[PDB]
Design a binder for these strands. Structure first.
Ligand SMILES: [Mg+2]
Ligand SMILES: [Mg+2]
Ligand SMILES: [Mg+2]
Ligand SMILES: [Mg+2]
Ligand SMILES: [Mg+2]
Ligand SMILES: [Mg+2]
Ligand SMILES: [Mg+2]
Ligand SMILES: [Mg+2]
Ligand SMILES: [Mg+2]
Ligand SMILES: [Mg+2]
Ligand SMILES: [Mg+2]
Ligand SMILES: [Mg+2]
Ligand SMILES: [Mg+2]
Ligand SMILES: [Mg+2]
Ligand SMILES: [Mg+2]
Ligand SMILES: [Mg+2]
Ligand SMILES: [Mg+2]
Ligand SMILES: [Mg+2]
Ligand SMILES: [Mg+2]
Ligand SMILES: [Mg+2]
Ligand SMILES: [Zn+2]
Ligand SMILES: [Zn+2]
Lengths: 78, 50, 203, 66, 136
RNA sequence: GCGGGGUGGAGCAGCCUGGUAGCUCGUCGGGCUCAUAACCCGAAGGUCGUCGGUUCAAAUCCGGCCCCCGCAACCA
RNA sequence: UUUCCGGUGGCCAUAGUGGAAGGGAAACACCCGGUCCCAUUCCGAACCCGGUCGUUAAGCCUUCCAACGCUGAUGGUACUGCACGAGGGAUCGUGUGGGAGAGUAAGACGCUGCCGGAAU
RNA sequence: GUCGCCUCCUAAAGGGUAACGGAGGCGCCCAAAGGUUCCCUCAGCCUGGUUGGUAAUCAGGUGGUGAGUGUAAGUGCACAAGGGGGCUUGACUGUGAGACUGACAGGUCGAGCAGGGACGAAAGUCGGGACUAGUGAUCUGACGGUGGCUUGUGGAUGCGCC
């Protein structure tokens, strides 16, 4: 008959933004899982080995632009 | 077989502290590294075991 | 030693005055002058051995007076049979006093003793006041020996001048003194070989 | 310049065996060089030549017959 | 028969056949033309039949433009076989036609014989189409 | 469908892998003979079915295609 | 206080690209040297050092030019959540909310903060 | 024919989503292709030039990403994560606030701290590699270290821990 040379696929990795704008986060809380820097680390946000953006401090998450880059900041809580 | 697992032991307290991989063809001889020896409690020269 | 070269002195006085008078530059620092001299040689038959590169290094070192930059192959090519990173050419950049005295030596001594020398074409400018030409043979530089050269090699000589336009570059290099300006012979062979190869059909 | 990588490039006069002598700090370890011919002593532009050609095909005819 | 020299992917999903014509709803090259009033798939065989009809009727004069191109491949399941075992091999090449799309254009021909040639062509197409002009 | 094969004029090597295409016969030129066959001495001869890709580089690696084979195409 | 200019940010083309004209008081710059720290996978070109003569030619600065590019409504259309409807069928329509892309008028030869400079 | 892992599409603008659906990869590699610090900008095109040709090396002009990235693809990267030089071993030991993601086993990220280092004038960065595949639970056995235990005691032997 016939057969397919396809049928392989990788497991779902579950990327994407995990905390949206204004959401209160704790220090170290993961903000976005991603491959490559679609979002760059902004103020109060660190970037991990697999390009995960996480919170360096408590506060509220905001998405903005720092110079020419899309960045994610954590504004310290009032 | 071409990139075997080599074990680095400290040349002071002969303790197999670390394990890593070399190329055997790109690095035929035993490798020398300065790693942290927990027993010697400092950075000591580490050599691949024979 | 400390002495401003003959060619540099001639350039400054005579050539700067002549250019200021017969181009009418409205600013004093617009008179063109030699910026640098580049001595290249592609020794591409070095993909099979290293002795040819050593000989080329010795020859260019003796000719110029400084160690050459040896360029490694940017990309490998099978039909030229060169791998990646092999040394296939060497070049020297001369500026200032070394530039001036090498140019003086070359013009006064070397190309005069080219076999059946007929001068240099005036139509070998890049189009921006810089003039590059080629020597097919090397030992004609009498600053080197004669009976120990490994093999005959050639080279490319490039004069880069701060000249905006081709006509003023030609004027500068004439005033410095270069065999050329004749007529056909130069431009003649030029047009010829030009048209000839200039076609292309890699497809 | 970097020390120890460049050749000897001391002074060097030049006798062109033709009434022309200059001084350039070339690489001639010995010193002055000896020119078989200068540029001002050479037949190229000092005008000492003028070959052009010999295109008188008819001129040959009356040379050997006229 | 119009067949593309190559395509990026030979096995593709069926083209969307919803909506009106995305673009090319107006005459761009010729004086008269065929405008499809209904959507559908237009195979290269149908395109060739219509083009042959128009050219043959207009004889030597005038010029014809084929605005659409059958660059979408359609696979066919192997005959007499149960469902499965992967997608088939491309068998047809179609163009995605939507209402209002100008399919063919004609120029350099008087209006009456142009109309007759367009009628001959339209009777070969699988969807309804009409003769259009630049208002004369 | 599975697997193999396509290289001078013919029949066959070169395919783990890239870089140097070989043997036998035949073709062609010269000897030997009265002449032919045989034999002796020299030479040419295939850019590798085709399209495309990989790669610095393809007979060799990969895919499509064409041709030739073999096998399978079953249970009621 | 103002004007002009040099640095250093912010917005990241409404700022760019290209063309034209003009300017240097401080300043910037090219420029002039290489002795000295230092430097070139060769080269005092660059980096670095020493000068500020020369020069506004260029960088830089000012004015001008919608020319390429950029920005860009309103209205309409596509699509669409919900609720229905019509065709033999591809598919299509309406109600009620949302509503582009393109295109059109147009905008635009940048805006703004701090520090320093020379003058007022 | 397929069975685990990775990338894309299908997948309907979070995540997830099946088929013997559509495309490809993986079972490595690198002592630098890791760390750090400083420096650099490509491909293409045009012109001129010994050998030299479309294309080697050289010069000028142009050119912002179309080159490049050890390896698929995507997301990234010209601020370079791309190219080069110097010095190095953090391809660390003891840790992990706080999160991500799975029915679970599990998979992933991680600030801060101490020890002891590398680099940098410093600020600082470094718990392998631009990112995501390059992998196998438990059992049983093995080697190295440690010396917790050892059936009367001391050894031995065996075991435990790492
Ligand atoms: Mg990392
Ligand atoms: Mg990692
Ligand atoms: Mg359009
Ligand atoms: Mg039976
Ligand atoms: Mg608009
Ligand atoms: Mg709009
Ligand atoms: Mg999704
Ligand atoms: Mg959805
Ligand atoms: Mg399901
Ligand atoms: Mg790098
Ligand atoms: Mg390791
Ligand atoms: Mg925790
Ligand atoms: Mg994973
Ligand atoms: Mg520390
Ligand atoms: Mg230090
Ligand atoms: Mg890497
Ligand atoms: Mg790196
Ligand atoms: Mg068991
Ligand atoms: Mg007892
Ligand atoms: Mg431990
Ligand atoms: Zn030790
Ligand atoms: Zn002479």
């Amino acid at each position: 008959a016939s057969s397919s040379r396809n049928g392989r696929d990788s497991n779902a990795q579950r990327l994407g933004v995990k905390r949206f704008g204004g959401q209160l986060v704790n220090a170290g809380e993961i903000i976005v899982r991603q491959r490559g820097t679609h979002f760059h680390p902004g103020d109060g946000v660190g970037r991990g080995g697999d390009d995960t953006l996480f919170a360096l401090r408590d506060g509220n998450v905001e998405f903005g632009t720092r110079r020419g880059r899309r960045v994610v900041n954590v504004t310290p809580v009032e | 077989d071409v990139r075997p697992k080599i074990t680095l032991a400290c040349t002071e307290c002969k303790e197999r502290n670390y394990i890593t991989k070399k190329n055997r063809r790109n690095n035929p001889d035993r490798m020398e590294m300065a790693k942290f020896c927990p027993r010697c409690r400092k950075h000591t020269a580490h050599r691949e075991t024979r | 030693a400390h002495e401003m070269p003959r060619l540099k002195k001639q350039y400054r006085e005579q050539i700067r005055a002549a250019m200021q008078e017969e181009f009418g530059y409205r600013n004093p620092m617009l008179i063109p002058g030699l910026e640098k001299i580049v001595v290249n040689m592609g020794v591409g038959d070095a993909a099979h051995d290293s002795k040819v590169m050593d000989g080329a290094i010795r020859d260019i070192t003796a000719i110029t007076g400084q160690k050459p930059q040896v360029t490694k192959a940017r990309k490998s090519i099978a039909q030229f049979k060169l791998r990646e990173g092999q040394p296939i050419g060497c070049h020297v950049t001369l500026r200032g006093d070394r530039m001036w005295e090498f140019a003086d030596r070359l013009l006064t001594l070397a190309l005069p003793r080219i076999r059946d020398f007929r001068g240099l074409n005036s139509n070998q400018f890049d189009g921006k006041g810089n003039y590059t030409f080629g020597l097919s043979e090397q030992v004609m530089f009498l600053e080197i020996d004669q009976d120990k050269i490994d093999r005959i090699r050639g080279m490319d000589i490039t004069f880069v001048t701060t000249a905006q336009t081709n006509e003023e570059g030609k004027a500068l290099l004439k005033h410095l003194g270069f065999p050329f300006k004749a007529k056909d012979d130069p431009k003649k062979a030029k047009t010829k070989r030009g048209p000839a190869y200039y076609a292309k059909k890699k497809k | 310049m970097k020390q120890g990588i460049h050749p000897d490039y001391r002074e060097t006069t030049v006798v062109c065996t033709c009434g022309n002598t200059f001084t350039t700090r070339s690489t001639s370890q010995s010193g002055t060089l000896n020119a078989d011919v200068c540029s001002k002593c050479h037949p190229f532009y000092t005008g000492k030549q003028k070959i052009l050609d010999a295109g008188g095909r008819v001129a040959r005819f009356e040379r050997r017959y006229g | 028969m119009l067949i593309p020299r190559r395509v990026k992917y030979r096995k593709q999903h069926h083209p969307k056949r919803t909506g009106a014509a995305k673009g090319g709803t107006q005459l761009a090259f010729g004086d008269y033309g065929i405008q499809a009033t209904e959507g559908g798939y237009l195979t290269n065989r149908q395109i060739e039949a219509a083009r042959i009809a128009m050219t043959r009727y207009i004889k030597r004069g005038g010029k014809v433009w084929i605005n659409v191109y059958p660059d979408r491949p359609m696979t066919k399941h192997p005959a007499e076989s149960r469902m499965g075992s992967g997608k088939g091999t491309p068998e047809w090449w179609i163009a995605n036609i939507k209402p209002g799309r100008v399919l063919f254009e004609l120029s350099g021909v008087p209006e009456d014989v142009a109309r007759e040639a367009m009628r001959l062509a339209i009777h070969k197409l699988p969807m309804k189409a009409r003769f259009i002009s630049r208002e004369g």
